[PDB]
A = this chain, B = another copy of it.
Amino acid sequence: RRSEAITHGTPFQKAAALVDLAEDGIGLPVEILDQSSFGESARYYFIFTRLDLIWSLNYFALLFLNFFEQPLWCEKNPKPSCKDRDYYYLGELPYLTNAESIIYEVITLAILLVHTFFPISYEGSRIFWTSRLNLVKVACVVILFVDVLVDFLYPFRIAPYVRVIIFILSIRELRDTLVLLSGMLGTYLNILALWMLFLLFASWIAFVMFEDTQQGLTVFTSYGATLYQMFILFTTSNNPDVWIPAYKSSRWSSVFFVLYVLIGVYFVTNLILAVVYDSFKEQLAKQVSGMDQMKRRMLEKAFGLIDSDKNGEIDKNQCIKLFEQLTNYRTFKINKDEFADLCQAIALRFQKEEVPSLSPNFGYAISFILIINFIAVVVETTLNWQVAEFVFGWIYVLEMALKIYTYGFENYWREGANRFDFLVTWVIVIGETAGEWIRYLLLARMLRLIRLLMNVQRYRAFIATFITLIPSLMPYLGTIFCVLCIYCSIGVQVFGGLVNAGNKKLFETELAEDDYLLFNFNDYPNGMVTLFNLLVMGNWQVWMESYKDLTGTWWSITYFVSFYVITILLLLNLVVAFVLEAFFTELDLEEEEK
């Protein structure tokens, strides 16, 4: 997909390059694809996209700035100060001073303004100002500009939310995931209405059944208390503890809670999963269709470049000339559809990527060396030798240099395996800063051995699906990560500074009894790890009840309830659906192979 060919080529070379771009799945913007003589501006798109590493690093730096900012509750002069990290159970990360914050923010905002406005070089100005995405992005950058200025001039701060929104808007797969999710919301709110109806009715039966009992006097003291406890019991996280008083009062009480948990878990939760799975499949099919439409648009523009006369047909001589300008670098009458089909048949079967400009047993040799390295490592840990780990590190950098010599980097880097092996080998060699942690990097290379279980048919599908999932779950896990970043910023804004060694109420909260005091919202990394504990649903109601006690209001539970409803019942059920569909796709592939 040579930028040279799209820019300068003879039209048959532009057509071959558009064909290759399309089948590689990396299309040009339609604003370029449609502008007739698009080569005059595609030059700018290519130079723009060559810098993608710099832009991505800017957006990751902008997102990570949230982890190093001082909590706003520390600014309003606590006694003692947040220098007494032990008093506030704070983390280890540094908090930026004002000078460092200004420098960081100025640099990242400058690169963000450059990235956001450079598209005006190839999208026409009238197209730029009419893209919805550009207008939202410009709104975000102007909010960050205001928030930078409003303290460079020296209730809450808006910046940390806008940084996450900009991050979402900057990665195509996150935008796609949020578009997908927006189609699922409507159907999800219906089953949520039925789930609420289930909780409300079950909690009313429970309440009136236990009204004068010890369960009533000690647990189900009111309808709202019953509904709260029954909601937590839907998660099973309080399972026996909540109804022990009934079981002490009558062993027959267990029948109610058995029925309730059996129906709630094995029927309602699984049906919520099934609804999320149906909706996911429908929206993914809509996405795939849209990408196939874009692919056709590109192939049709290539046909419009070979057609120099607008008669909507191509002849033998134009066809063979295109066939040479295709087969020489990238791999009778015809029409638009015949051309698109005939082209896609090459990708279907004949297509192999050619090597860009500038032995089988070797894999077995390195497999032997790395398995010897693994046995040497284990016999070292059991103490049954730095020269071995050194010679292995040397052999791994030799393998990397040999590959990049014999294949060339633009070929080498294409493989998902070796592009990892390269990074970890580089980290290994740059770790020679003159610690034992290089043991774990060496085993991070050793994990490549697991691919050999794909040679064993009883393991081939499982391992192959796992390898496929490692990259392909990244948009979904990244969306969950962005939801956590937003919930973290909210939590630190509303709960920061309540968990402190002088609080006195704290030492009654259950957070103290379970020794969870480091899992607090006083700090951004603290909040992130706490939100991971909540996402795991393990002992999760401890935090909810403790912060209810520390804030003194029931409204605090809205945070934890909404977090549960968004993350568990939706996004993780999405991850389940995605993994199941991936496995079944791998089986359908092998059923075509076998």
Contacts and interface: CB of A to CB of B under 8 A. Distances in A.
Interface in A206-232: 208-209
B536 A208 contact: no
Interface stretch (A56-64, A115-123, A398-406, A525-533): A525-533
B580 A270 contact: yes
Contact of A459 (B190, B244, B378, B439): B190
A237 B518 CA distance: 19
A583 B241 CA distance: 33
Given A518-B248, A579-B271, A536 B265 contact: yes
Given A205-B443, A271-B462, A278-B583, 14 more contacts: A187-B458, A190-B458, A190-B459, A190-B462, A240-B516, A240-B538, A240-B539, A241-B515, A244-B516, A254-B532, A261-B536, A265-B536, A266-B579, A270-B580
Nearest to A195: B462
A267 interface: yes
A557 interface: no
The complex is assembled from copies of this chain, and their number is 2
Interface string A188-212: 0011001000000000110011000
Given A92-B251, A247-B518, A459-B194, A576 B273 contact: yes
29 contacts: A92-B250, A190-B459, A190-B462, A205-B440, A209-B440, A236-B537, A236-B538, A239-B533, A239-B536, A240-B516, A240-B533, A244-B515, A244-B516, A247-B529, A248-B518, A251-B525, A254-B529, A258-B532, A266-B579, A267-B579, A270-B575, A270-B576, A270-B580, A271-B583, A273-B579, A274-B579, A275-B462, A275-B583, A278-B583
A587 interface: yes
A47 to B, nearest CB: 37
Contacts of A473: 266
A208 B239 contact: no
Chief secondary structure at chain A's binding surface: helix
A381 interface: yes
B194 A580 contact: no
Interface in A560-590: 572, 575-576, 579-580, 583-584, 587
A469 interface: yes
Nearest to A277: B580
A91 interface: yes
B538 A237 contact: yes
A423 B537 CA distance: 40
A536 B236 contact: yes
A241 B265 CA distance: 25
A579 B244 CA distance: 31
A205 B583 CA distance: 28
Nearest to A528: B254
A514 interface: yes
Contacts of A576: 270, 273
Q: Which 9 A-B pairs have the closest CB atoms?
A: A239-B538, A274-B583, A270-B579, A236-B538, A190-B458, A274-B580, A92-B251, A239-B536, A254-B529
A405 to B, nearest CB: 33
Contacts of A277: 580
